């Protein structure tokens, strides 16, 4: 994929309408959301979708009742917006208590247990007494555990649809919901001789510790540019997360712009910056979507998303590289770290013309310079 291709929103047909989708946006051709779309039906007047994606799972409700959609992914939010579907940039747990009759929730299993449980409690709290919840999942990805946990929270609940390993359950709130568990976490770490206290919400990458790959990148960057090498320089951190790379670079004096697609991660970065008396731009953005057309940088760094145990570079990761090459000023430098299995070398060679390997250990740190 090219740049325009990655950022393009494409409308796909369905009976009675169209729905916009794009690379990097979850929700389409997803068995769980698909089963939901075949199962959900109206109940009451106010519905809430706590894991919208492109909005296919709860689409049957559109036009038949009021539907609120709390979306955390910017890529997905762009699609919902283009589709004309009511949606808010919001975390699942920001949902108003007891203000809904129906909640639709495709289990966000990929985000981890904490995120899932926060979403389950948010659903229980969002519903009025007697409210209904459609919970969908994969038996191979925790459905049974979470369904049982949802029953414990609400009371009544039974499976109402099955397809292969995919399931949809319907539950009713018969008991008062518990308060929201504390969701903020914080941990201290020493990076390149300095101390930092990172703060993060559920679902962030590498929760509770600085990822070894991120550390490797920073060590390689300092070795190549020096401890003052980024002072006063404009830096773009692709997929900033809670700031493993962002905070140290800001502390080193760089003018950093972090772009992150996940809202929970964006808020984590913002709290971290504040807590460490550091300043940087923490943008909620689908890759470089939030930037001006003219924005350019002196240094770009990234620890791109990846599939555990996979050997294929993800669409978003490829876009990170393409954007890096396009956003760097001539003479500017790009640092990328990844597991040994990913074939980034030919990609960098193609996009930059040449590249270098700065480190080869548990992870490999690749480097490239922008040619004018
Ligand atoms: C492997 S993590 C690393 C995060 C952080 N830089 C670190 O080193 O700990 C990759 C980051 O890319 C973010 N991401 C995924 N898709 C994205 C997208 N389309 N645009 C921007 N960021 C994205 C993920 O949410 C995650 O925060």
The structural domains of the chain, with segments of one domain joined by +, span 1-177, 178-372
Of 75, 110, 205, which is best to mutate to test ligand 1, by the most ligand atoms within 8 angstroms of its C-beta? 205
- Would the CB of 62 count as within 6 Å of ligand 1? no
* Nearest Cα residue to 176 out of 133, 128, 132: 128
**Which ligand 1 atom is the nearest neighbour of the CA of 214?**
8
CA 260, 223, 295 angle in degrees (round to 5)? 35
Cα 239 to middle of ligand 1, angstroms: 3
Q: Is 293 exposed, middle or buried (0-12, 13-18, 19+ CB in 10 A)?
A: exposed
Cα 242 to middle of ligand 1, angstroms: 9
Please, how many CA atoms are within 13 Å of residue 336, restricted to the half-sphere of its CB? Answer: 31
User: Can you point out the beta strands (E) in the chain?
Assistant: 10-14, 17-21, 46-49, 66-71, 88-89, 100-106, 127-138, 157-163, 166-172, 185-191, 194-200, 234-238, 255-260, 281-284, 297-302, 328-338, 356-360, 364-369
Dist CA 331 CA 159 (whole Å): 59
CA 36, 289, 10 angle in degrees (round to 5)? 45
Write out the DSSP string of 152-169.
HHHS-EEEEEEETTEEEE
Q: What is the DSSP letter of 109?
A: G
Q: Provide the token pair at 193.
A: 């001789």
Cα 314 to middle of ligand 1, angstroms: 12
CB 223 within 8 A of CB 358: yes
* Nearest Cα residue to 57 out of 39, 77, 71, 80: 39
Name the experimental technique.
X-ray
- Would the CB of 205 count as within 6 Å of ligand 1? yes
Q: How far is CA 245 from CA 23, 167, 261, 318, 372, in A?
A: 25, 39, 16, 19, 27
Asked if residue 211 belongs to a known ligand binding site, the reply is yes
Q: How far is CA 286 from CA 53, 223, 264, 271, 290, in A?
A: 14, 30, 14, 20, 7
CB 351 within 8 A of CB 322: yes
Asked if residue 51 belongs to a known ligand binding site, the reply is no
Nearest alpha carbon, ligand 1 atom 14: 239
Contacts of 54 (CB under 8 A, 6+ apart): 19, 20, 21, 25, 26, 27, 28, 76, 79, 80, 83
Class of domain 178-372: alpha beta
Dist CA 311 CA 101 (whole Å): 44
Which CATH number is 1-177 given? 3.40.50.150
- Would the CB of 338 count as within 6 Å of ligand 1? no
CB 300 within 8 A of CB 240: no
CA 290, 312, 308 angle in degrees (round to 5)? 85
- Would the CB of 211 count as within 6 Å of ligand 1? yes
Same fold, 1-177 and 178-372: yes
Q: Provide the token pair at 329.
A: 């000023």
């Amino acid at each position: 994929l090219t740049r325009e291709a990655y950022h393009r929103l494409t409308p796909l047909p369905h009976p009675g309408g169209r729905l916009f989708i794009k690379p990097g946006a979850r929700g389409y051709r997803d068995p769980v959301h698909d089963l939901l779309q075949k199962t959900v039906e109206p109940f009451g007047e106010r519905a809430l979708d706590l894991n919208p994606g492109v909005g296919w799972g709860s689409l049957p409700l559109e036009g038949r009742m009021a539907v609120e959609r709390l979306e955390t992914s910017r890529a997905a939010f762009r699609c919902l917006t283009a589709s004309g579907l009511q949606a808010r940039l919001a975390l699942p747990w920001e949902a108003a208590a007891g203000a809904y009759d129906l909640v639709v929730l495709a289990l966000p299993a990929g985000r981890g247990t904490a995120y899932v449980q926060a979403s389950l409690v948010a659903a229980a709290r969002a519903l009025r007494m007697g409210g209904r919840l459609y919970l969908a999942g994969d038996k191979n990805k925790g459905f049974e555990r979470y369904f049982k946990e949802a029953r414990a929270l609400l009371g009544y609940g039974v499976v109402v649809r099955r397809e292969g390993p995919y399931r949809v359950a319907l539950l009713e709130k018969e008991k008062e919901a518990p308060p929201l568990p504390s969701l903020w976490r914080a941990f201290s770490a020493r990076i390149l001789g300095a101390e930092y206290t990172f703060h993060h919400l559920p679902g962030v990458f590498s929760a509770g510790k600085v990822d070894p790959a991120s550390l490797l990148l920073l060590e390689a960057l300092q070795e190549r540019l020096g401890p003052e090498g980024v002072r006063g320089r404009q830096v773009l951190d692709l997929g900033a997360g809670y700031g493993a790379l962002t905070l140290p670079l800001a502390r080193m004096g760089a003018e950093v712009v972090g772009v992150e697609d996940d809202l929970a991660s964006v808020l984590s970065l913002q709290k971290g910056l504040e807590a460490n008396a550091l300043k940087a731009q923490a943008l909620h953005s689908d890759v470089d979507e939030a930037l001006t057309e003219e924005a350019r940088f002196d240094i770009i760094v990234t620890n791109p998303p990846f599939h555990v145990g996979g050997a294929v570079i993800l669409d978003v990761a490829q876009a990170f590289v393409n954007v890096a090459a396009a956003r760097l000023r001539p003479g500017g430098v790009f640092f990328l770290v990844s597991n040994p299995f990913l074939k980034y070398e030919p990609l960098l060679e193609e996009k930059f013309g040449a590249f270098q390997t700065l480190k080869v250990a548990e992870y490999k740190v690749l480097f490239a310079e922008k040619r004018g």
